[PDB]
Every structure is written in C-alpha cells, then in structure tokens.
Amino acid sequence: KRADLIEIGAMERFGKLDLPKVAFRHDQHTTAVTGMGKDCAACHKSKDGKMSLKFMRLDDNSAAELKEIYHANCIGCHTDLAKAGKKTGPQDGECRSCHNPKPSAASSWKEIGFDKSLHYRHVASKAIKPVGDPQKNCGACHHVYDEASKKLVWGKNKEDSCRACHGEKPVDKRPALDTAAHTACISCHMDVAKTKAETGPVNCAGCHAPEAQAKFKVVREVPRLDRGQPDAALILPVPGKDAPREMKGTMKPVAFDHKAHEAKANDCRTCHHVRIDTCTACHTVNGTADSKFVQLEKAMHQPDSMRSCVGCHNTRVQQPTCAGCHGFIKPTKSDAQCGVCHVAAPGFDAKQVEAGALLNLKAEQRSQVAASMLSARPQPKGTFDLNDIPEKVVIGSIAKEYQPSEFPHRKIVKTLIAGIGEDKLAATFHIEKGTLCQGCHHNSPASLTPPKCASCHGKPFDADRGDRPGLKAAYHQQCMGCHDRMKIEKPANTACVDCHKER
Ligand code: HEC
Ligand code: HEC
Ligand code: HEC
Ligand code: HEC
Ligand code: HEC
Ligand code: HEC
Ligand code: HEC
Ligand code: HEC
Ligand code: HEC
Ligand code: HEC
Ligand code: HEC
Ligand code: HEC
Ligand code: HEC
Ligand code: HEC
Questions:
Q1: In the chain, which segments carry CATH 3.90.10.10?
Q2: Pocket probe mutation, ligand 14, options 429, 438, 442, max atoms within 8 Å of Cβ
Q3: 423 CB less than 6 Å from ligand 14?
Q4: 176 and 169 in contact (C-beta within 8 Å)?
C-alpha cells in the first residue's frame, strides 16, 4: 500500500527498453536522505530559483546521457552507503533488483484537489503574504500570461483552477498540471516550513495517501470566495457564431441564483468543469466543437450529470428524506414544472430578443434583470393544512387473510414535511399545495380529495397477466418501497402484523 511509487522510464522516449522500468519509492528515499543530513538537492538540480522535478539534470538530452545519469548517481549513493555499513539500495551488479518486472502494484495513490474548505485555509493564512493588494493574497498563487511584459502577473478577478490552463501534457510554455502543481505547491510548502509556521505537505504520501487526506482539517465556516461573480445570472439560448439562422430560442430565458448556489456547493469547478465563464461560450443551442457538440439543452437538463441543473438536482433527490417519494413517482415534464426555471423577463418578451443583445449588456445590467426575475417568482405555496386530511386511514377493501390495515396517514405526511425541513429545491419545485400528496397519490391532479387506489389498480384476480400492479401489489410496492428508500426501521417489511394484524 504505497502512494509514492514512480516508475522510472524516461528512456522509452528514445526507443524500446532493453530492461524493465525501475520502480522507485520516493518517500523511502527522502526519509533516508534527510536522515543523512541532506535535502532535495542531493538529487534535483535548480535554475533561476526553480527546482527541476527531474533527477540530476535540467534536460533529457539523449538516451545515452540519461542512462549514465541514472546509473552513476543512483548507484554511486548505494555504493557509498554499503561501503559505510548503512542500510542501502541495489548495488551495481544487481541489475534485476532495480530493473524489476514484478511490482504488480501496492499503490494507494489518489488525486488531490482543493474543495472550498482547503482553499480557504490557504487564503486565511498569515504565512501567505498579500501581493499587489494590501488585503489580498490571490496573486501569491494565481496568474495569467501578460503578453505585454512578457511575464506572469496576478490577473485581478481572473483567478481560476490550475486545471483551466495546465493540462495532461505541457503546451510548450505552460506545464502540464502535475509539474505546475508540484513546482508551485511543494516549493511554497518548503519555504514556509523553514519558518516553522504551519505548512502543507511535501512527502508524496502527504498529499496522495488516502489516510493522510482524511486527516486534513476541514472547515464548514467557509466565507464566500469572491472574484467578481454575479449574485444573479441570466442564462440564454445562445445560437453561436456559425449557425445559418441565428434563431432566438423556444423557451423563456432563465434567471439563476448564483450566490445561493455557491453557498451550497463544494467549489466552483463542479459546474465550471473547464474554466470559469458562461456555459454558453461553448454549449450553444446546437453545440460547438468547444463543447464536443454537447448542446445547451444537454448541458442544462442532462439527467445523470452533476454539472447540469436537472442532474445535480437529481442527485439531491436520492437523499433518504427525499427518496421515499422520488424513487416512486415519475416526472410530469409539465409546462408548470419547466416554468419553475424558464420565466418572464421584466419589461419585454425575451423570446423576441437575440441572445447577443442580452450577453452584450454590462454584467451589472444583466444581474439586475435576473434579480428582478428571481424576486418576482411566486412565493412557496406549501402544502394543504394537514388537518383537512384523514388522520388515519383504514385500508381494507381486499381484507381477507389478515385484517384491514390501519395506517398513520397524517403523521407520515408531517414527517415527510419535517424531513424536507428547510430545503429550497423542494420548497420551490413543490408547486401546488397537493404536490406532496402526489408522492403517493400518483397520476391524478394535485388535490385535497385524491381517488382511492382501487379507482384504478385492478381488483386482485390475475395470477398470470395483469396490466400494471393489481391492488395488493401496489400497496406492498408503495408502502414497503418507501420504507426501504427512507431507511425506516419499523415496521419492518417482514413484520406482516405490524401493518395488518391477523384473522
Ligand atoms: C494553480 C493556481 C496554478 C498553478 C499552481 C500554476 N498555474 Fe499557471 N501558467 C499559465 C501560463 C499561460 C503559463 C506559461 C507562462 C509563460 O508563457 O511563461 C503558466 C505557467 C505556469 C508555471 C510555470 C512557471 C515558470 O516560469 O516556468 C507554473 C508553475 C504554473 N503556471 C502554475 C496560465 C495559467 C492559467 C490561465 C488562465 C491559470 C488558470 C493557471 N496558470 C493556474 C495555475
Ligand atoms: C526534496 C524533499 C524533494 C522534492 C521536494 C522532490 N524530490 Fe524527487 N525524484 C527523484 C526521482 C528519481 C524522480 C523521478 C524523475 C526522474 O526519474 O527523472 C523524482 C521526481 C520528483 C517529483 C515528480 C513526481 C512525479 O512522479 O510526478 C517531485 C514532485 C519531486 N521529485 C520532488 C529522486 C529524488 C531523490 C533521490 C534520492 C531525492 C532526495 C528527491 N527526489 C527529493 C525530492
Ligand atoms: C546491472 C548491471 C544493470 C544493467 C545491465 C542495466 N542497469 Fe540500469 N537503469 C536504472 C534506471 C533508473 C534506468 C533508466 C530507466 C528508464 O528510463 O527506462 C536505467 C537504465 C538502463 C538501461 C537503458 C534503458 C533500457 O532498458 O534499455 C539499461 C540497458 C540498463 N539500465 C542496464 C537504474 C539501475 C539501478 C538502480 C540502482 C541499477 C542497480 C541498475 N540500473 C542496474 C543495471
Ligand atoms: C512525491 C514525489 C510525489 C509524487 C511521486 C507524486 N506526487 Fe503529486 N500531485 C499534486 C497535485 C495537485 C496533482 C495534480 C493532479 C491532482 O490534482 O491530484 C499531482 C499530480 C501527480 C501525478 C500525476 C497523475 C496523473 O496521471 O495526472 C503523480 C504521478 C503524482 N502527483 C505523484 C499534489 C501533490 C502534492 C501537494 C503538496 C505533493 C506533495 C505531491 N503531489 C507529491 C507527489
Ligand atoms: C484570493 C482571495 C483568491 C481568490 C479570489 C482565488 N484564489 Fe485560488 N486556487 C488555488 C488553487 C491551487 C486552486 C485549484 C484547486 C484545485 O483545482 O484543486 C484554486 C482555485 C481557485 C478558483 C476556482 C475554484 C475551484 O473550484 O477550483 C478560484 C475562483 C480562485 N481560486 C480564486 C490556490 C490559491 C492560493 C494558494 C495558496 C491562494 C492564496 C489563492 N488561490 C487565493 C485565491
Ligand atoms: C442550472 C444552471 C441550475 C438551475 C437553473 C438551478 N440549479 Fe440548483 N440547487 C442546488 C441545491 C443544493 C439547491 C437547494 C439549495 C438550498 O437548500 O438553499 C438548489 C436549489 C435550486 C433552486 C431553489 C432555490 C433557488 O435558487 O431558486 C432553483 C430554482 C435552482 N436550484 C435552479 C444544486 C445545484 C447544482 C449542484 C451542483 C447545480 C449544477 C445546480 N443546482 C444547477 C442549477
Ligand atoms: C409480511 C411479509 C406480509 C404478508 C404475508 C402480507 N403483508 Fe400486506 N398489505 C398491506 C396493505 C396496506 C394491504 C391492503 C389491505 C387491505 O386493503 O385490506 C395489504 C394487503 C395484503 C394482502 C391481501 C389482503 C388480504 O388480507 O388478503 C396480503 C395477503 C398481505 N398483505 C400479506 C401492507 C403491508 C405492509 C405495510 C407496509 C406490510 C409490512 C405487509 N403488508 C406485510 C405483509
Ligand atoms: C397531501 C396533503 C395528501 C392529501 C391531501 C391526501 N393524502 Fe393520502 N392516502 C394514502 C393512501 C395509501 C390512501 C388510501 C387510498 C385507498 O385506499 O384507495 C390515502 C388516502 C387518502 C384519502 C382518502 C381517500 C379515500 O377516498 O379513501 C384522502 C382524502 C387523502 N389520502 C388525501 C397515502 C398517502 C401518502 C403516502 C405516503 C401521502 C404523502 C398522502 N397520502 C398525502 C395526502
Ligand atoms: C393509491 C395511492 C395508489 C397506489 C398505492 C398505487 N397507485 Fe398506481 N399506477 C397507475 C398507472 C397508470 C400505473 C402504471 C405505471 C405508471 O404509469 O406509473 C401505476 C403504477 C403503480 C405502481 C408500480 C410503479 C412501478 O414503478 O413499477 C404502484 C406501486 C402503484 N401504481 C400504486 C395509476 C394510478 C391511478 C390512476 C388514476 C391511481 C388513482 C393510482 N395509481 C393510485 C395508486
Ligand atoms: C542516496 C543519496 C540515494 C540515492 C541517490 C538513491 N538511493 Fe536508492 N536507496 C537509498 C537508501 C538509503 C535505500 C534503502 C532505503 C530503505 O529504507 O531501506 C535505497 C533503496 C533503493 C531501492 C530498494 C527498494 C526497497 O528496498 O524497498 C531501490 C530500488 C532504489 N533505492 C533505487 C534507486 C534509484 C532508481 C535511484 C536513482 C534513481 C536511487 N535509488 C538513488 C539511497 C539512495
Ligand atoms: C503558498 C503560496 C502555498 C502554496 C502555493 C500552496 N500551499 Fe498548501 N499550504 C500552505 C500553507 C501555509 C499551509 C498551512 C495552512 C494552515 O495554516 O493550516 C498549507 C496547507 C496545505 C495543506 C494542508 C494539509 C493539512 O495538514 O491539513 C494541503 C493539503 C495543501 N496545502 C496542499 C496544497 C496544494 C495541493 C497546493 C497546490 C495545488 C498548495 N497547497 C499550494 C501554503 C501554500
Ligand atoms: C432548471 C432546473 C430547469 C428546468 C426545470 C428546465 N430548464 Fe430548460 N433550461 C434551463 C437552463 C439554465 C437553460 C439555458 C437557458 C435558456 O433559457 O436558454 C435551459 C434551456 C432550455 C432549452 C434550449 C434553449 C431553448 O430552446 O430555449 C430548451 C429547449 C429547454 N430549456 C427546455 C426545457 C423544458 C421543455 C423544460 C421542462 C420540461 C425545461 N427546459 C426545464 C434550465 C431548466
Ligand atoms: C468550453 C469552454 C465549455 C464550457 C465553457 C462549458 N462546457 Fe460543458 N462540456 C464541454 C465539453 C468539451 C464537454 C464534453 C467533454 C466533457 O468534458 O465531457 C462538456 C460536457 C458537459 C456536460 C455533459 C457531461 C456528460 O456526462 O457527457 C454538461 C452537463 C456540461 N458540460 C455542463 C456545463 C455547464 C453547466 C457549464 C457552465 C457552468 C459548462 N458546461 C461550460 C465544454 C464546456
Ligand atoms: C412526497 C411527499 C415528496 C417528497 C417527500 C419530496 N418530493 Fe419532491 N416532488 C414530489 C412530487 C409529486 C413532485 C412532482 C413531480 C413532477 O414532475 O411533477 C416533486 C418534485 C420535485 C422536484 C422537481 C421535479 C423533478 O425534477 O423531479 C424537485 C427538484 C424536488 N421535488 C426536490 C425535492 C427534494 C430536494 C426533496 C427532499 C428534500 C423532495 N423533492 C421531497 C413529491 C415529493
């Protein structure tokens, strides 16, 4: 179980290896060289104040130069160590002990990233001094390339994840993500270490061991990370540069409570999966090569993505307090439900306006329109006064093998409501007083007087073919299914008499 394994194979670049690649355990090496009184410089060279992540060179010049670099420096240390009686590595004649095919695995490595709590601990840190702003420390970490001064500069309000510009491999001036991260994070972690203030880790396991990550202090006291995003955004059906038509849209546009969404999410990137910007710069109505022709409709409504409005919302719906109802019902895809998001802009018919004219507005003007949209929504409707519903229901129309079932209708509804508690997805998407009722009274209008299940679930007569569930099967599927999705302990589905006593 290691998080610090590296497979050394730089040579493959120049041709097929004669021998296996060389497993190397970096934390085993660093533990040992520190104890010998040495540091990173024992194996990495520097230039311009920057440590190279490569072993004992600035460049991969030839096959022959790397092979000599490794043997001469890797072995040389193992030799001196053995000649001194210390614990050590493979010696010069031990080819297969370095060049070893077997290491199947034993890798526990894991990606690391900044959630909002870990990003705050860096901002709020006194060892990371402000720069270019009396109060702000953003420029200690974030940059953009300034063509004018031919150099990196802190772009105020242009901060983004490193992933937005640093990818899988280098793109000539900008390093790939791993070297970016390893160069910036570790080197500051080591400066701050010299002043014995609190710091971040430098051992590989320290960032990459699952156990280490679990140990990090987490903070739910997280202030708004604030570059200059809007509180209220106006999302639009964007046609895109290359579209024969330039067609408006088909729906009304959608105001979006950006500030509230921030406070509920874990970072920015979950939504802005490529870079902070609109979504429409790439996901247009018809899609674009920048999305990979993934169209705006897929981006905003896709059922199983955490990135989309519908998709993220779908995962909140699996939480037990919700899933009783949400695992049973089907969607109406009704115009009222679409209209929870697609609303009227104040003062005009957005459908008669091209995207461009709204995108071209100044951010503060567009925010004001969305805000007005947001503010005009209908207040939460709530459900019926539970006193207008039967406190108890006895279900006995097919009683036989057992007595009829006495069921605590009203108490169960209050608990559903209590479990929903303050959740705002539910308060706004539960659009009719009887919406909650439809969690069990499916397929009929929201109402104080829903019909009985028998009104349309066959009496109990077909052992073989029966269009949707007969009566008994529908009660059992509804009652027992909710109890399991909600993790209700009692009654238990095996406890027949707890829902209907015998006789
Ligand atoms: C997380 C906040 C980030 C880290 C850590 C780094 N970046 Fe960047 N970066 C960007 C460009 C265009 C370059 C090339 C600059 C040039 O033309 O010389 C870089 C370079 C780096 C480097 C190399 C430093 C060196 O002198 O060799 C490091 C270590 C690095 N970046 C770390 C651009 C961007 C960017 C575009 C918007 C973002 C979001 C980031 N970098 C984020 C991070
Ligand atoms: C002092 C504590 C350090 C720090 C901060 C780093 N190392 Fe090393 N390192 C060594 C070797 C053989 C490699 C593989 C590169 C190659 O073969 O050319 C590395 C690599 C790294 C990385 C990159 C990790 C990755 O796989 O992406 C990093 C971030 C790194 N080093 C930092 C060898 C050694 C040593 C030889 C005994 C010593 C000592 C160190 N490294 C020390 C450090
Ligand atoms: C015992 C004498 C040998 C022999 C015959 C070879 N090695 Fe090594 N070697 C080491 C490392 C890290 C490399 C680079 C790995 C890579 O980038 O792929 C090498 C390289 C080689 C090569 C060239 C690559 C190839 O497979 O063609 C060859 C032919 C080679 N070695 C032969 C490291 C070590 C050791 C670490 C201490 C030890 C011991 C050895 N090598 C020993 C030998
Ligand atoms: C000590 C030498 C190591 C070694 C061997 C590795 N890491 Fe790191 N690393 C860090 C971050 C932020 C990234 C970007 C990817 C991510 O977000 O987790 C990486 C990337 C790597 C890779 C590349 C994996 C890939 O397939 O893209 C590898 C092999 C890797 N690391 C190994 C963060 C850290 C640390 C934060 C302080 C430190 C310490 C390390 N890594 C150290 C090492
Ligand atoms: C000063 C207050 C700021 C502001 C306004 C921002 N940062 Fe950071 N930031 C840092 C790193 C390593 C990341 C990448 C995290 C990852 O991919 O795991 C970020 C990310 C951001 C974002 C996008 C947030 C996201 O969802 O990923 C934004 C909008 C942002 N930053 C703004 C690193 C640092 C620092 C290093 C110690 C510090 C200081 C800052 N950032 C400071 C700020
Ligand atoms: C795509 C851009 C959208 C749109 C149009 C909406 N969301 Fe979300 N949402 C999420 C969570 C956790 C909640 C409840 C928050 C709380 O309890 O305070 C919500 C709530 C809403 C609402 C109701 C409140 C409101 O702002 O009006 C609405 C109308 C709404 N959402 C619209 C979570 C997410 C996501 C998780 C990653 C993502 C993606 C989205 N929402 C995306 C969208
Ligand atoms: C334990 C596994 C059992 C067994 C053997 C049965 N049930 Fe139930 N059942 C429930 C409800 C609300 C009804 C409708 C009652 C009515 O309209 O009279 C039923 C119906 C049945 C029947 C058919 C009716 C009859 O009496 O013949 C049978 C044979 C039956 N059940 C067997 C509800 C529940 C539960 C509530 C969640 C639980 C638990 C069970 N039943 C468990 C069992
Ligand atoms: C939201 C406030 C409501 C309202 C207004 C009602 N219910 Fe229910 N209810 C449920 C079941 C399984 C039955 C028995 C149906 C049958 O046996 O055919 C009932 C019964 C009712 C009635 C009586 C209807 C009748 O004519 O007998 C009424 C007026 C009624 N309900 C209103 C189950 C549930 C739920 C399961 C968890 C939930 C939620 C609700 N009901 C919610 C509501
Ligand atoms: C009284 C509350 C009930 C109960 C307990 C159930 N129904 Fe219905 N139902 C109806 C139709 C047309 C179907 C076919 C499937 C569908 O269209 O959703 C169903 C299906 C069910 C199931 C099975 C669901 C599954 O996902 O496999 C169950 C457990 C169930 N129902 C229970 C139609 C209606 C009504 C039409 C007006 C009425 C009223 C009810 N059902 C009432 C109830
Ligand atoms: C001293 C400066 C070292 C240099 C440079 C390299 N290695 Fe090493 N190595 C060193 C020590 C003190 C040890 C033993 C560590 C321990 O805790 O036992 C090692 C060990 C290895 C091993 C053996 C792996 C194992 O026993 O579990 C290998 C395969 C190894 N070293 C490879 C290796 C390579 C490939 C190096 C250059 C890349 C290298 N070592 C340099 C000390 C030093
Ligand atoms: C200075 C400019 C830093 C850079 C850039 C990065 N880190 Fe950092 N980190 C720094 C400090 C001063 C601290 C201690 C903060 C405190 O007061 O608690 C940290 C802490 C971390 C931690 C905490 C680990 C823990 O023990 O809980 C982690 C995991 C961490 N830093 C990771 C990290 C990464 C991945 C970075 C680049 C992507 C990075 N840090 C940059 C200082 C600085
Ligand atoms: C939030 C949870 C949404 C719900 C529910 C629905 N839509 Fe949606 N849709 C949403 C956003 C943020 C967007 C992008 C903004 C815009 O108005 O363009 C969309 C976009 C569409 C589109 C494509 C553009 C257009 O045709 O106007 C379509 C066709 C669309 N929306 C249709 C649609 C329907 C039919 C819905 C109910 C069934 C519906 N959306 C719900 C966000 C949300
Ligand atoms: C280019 C700069 C984009 C921006 C801006 C946004 N998205 Fe994207 N998206 C992009 C690509 C290239 C892809 C496919 C490649 C990939 O990463 O999958 C996507 C895909 C999506 C999806 C579908 C996910 C799936 O499982 O296939 C969604 C739901 C999505 N994108 C949402 C989305 C949102 C909400 C954006 C603004 C916050 C956004 N994207 C911007 C490219 C780009
Ligand atoms: C039964 C009592 C319910 C519980 C408990 C919760 N929801 Fe619900 N919800 C219910 C119904 C009958 C509907 C109507 C479905 C339709 O499409 O007409 C809904 C609707 C929603 C929706 C949006 C519609 C959808 O996209 O599925 C959302 C986003 C929603 N509800 C959220 C939500 C959450 C977060 C809940 C737990 C907190 C929750 N609902 C509970 C019935 C019931």
A1: 1-101, 109-217, 231-305+341-379, 306-340+380-503
A2: 429
A3: yes
A4: yes
Tokens 């080591």 locate to 190
320: helix, strand or coil: helix
Does 309 show up as a binding residue in the annotation?
yes
- Technique used to solve these coordinates: X-ray
CATH architecture of 231-305+341-379: Alpha-Beta Complex (3.90)
| Residue 275 Cα distances to 159, 163, 268, 271, 281, angstroms | 10, 8, 9, 9, 11
Closest listed residue to residue 416, CA positions, set 348, 325, 328 = 325
The sign of the dihedral angle between the CA atoms of 187, 191, 197, 202 is: positive
User: In whole angstroms, how far apart are CA 185 and each of 113, 141, 192, 196, 201?
Assistant: 12, 9, 11, 17, 9
DSSP 502: B
Considering the segment(s) 109-217 as one domain, its CATH architecture is: Alpha-Beta Complex (3.90)
Listed resolution, Å: 2.4
Spacing of C-alpha 345 from chain mean position: 31
Two structure tokens written together for 157:
């309000």
Strand runs (DSSP E) across 113-171, as ranges?
144-146, 151-153
User: Given CA atoms 435, 437, 442, 445 in this order, what sign does their dihedral have?
Assistant: negative
Q: Which three-class secondary structure state does DSSP give residue 337?
A: helix
Residue 282: CB atoms within 10 Å: 21
Helix (H/G/I), strand (E/B), else coil: 249: coil
Which ligand has the nearest atom to the CA of 441? Answer: 9
> What is the atom index within ligand 6 of the atom nearest the CA of 271?
39
Residue pair 457/468 in contact (Cβ under 8 Å)? The answer is yes
Strands 22-25 and 50-51: unpaired
Is CATH 3.90.10.10 what the domain over 306-340+380-503 is classified as, yes or no?
yes
Class of domain 1-101: alpha beta
Query: How many residues are listed for the chain in this entry?
Result: 503
* CA atoms of 370 and 253, how far apart (whole Å): 10
Q: Tell me whether residue 215 is annotated as binding.
A: no
Closest C-alpha among 499, 498, 332, 487 to residue 419: 487
Residues 6+ apart with CB under 8 A from 108: 1, 2, 3, 209, 210
The reply to whether ligand 11 has any atom less than 6 angstroms from the CB of 191 is no
How far is it, in rounded angstroms, from Cα 257 to Cα 373? 10
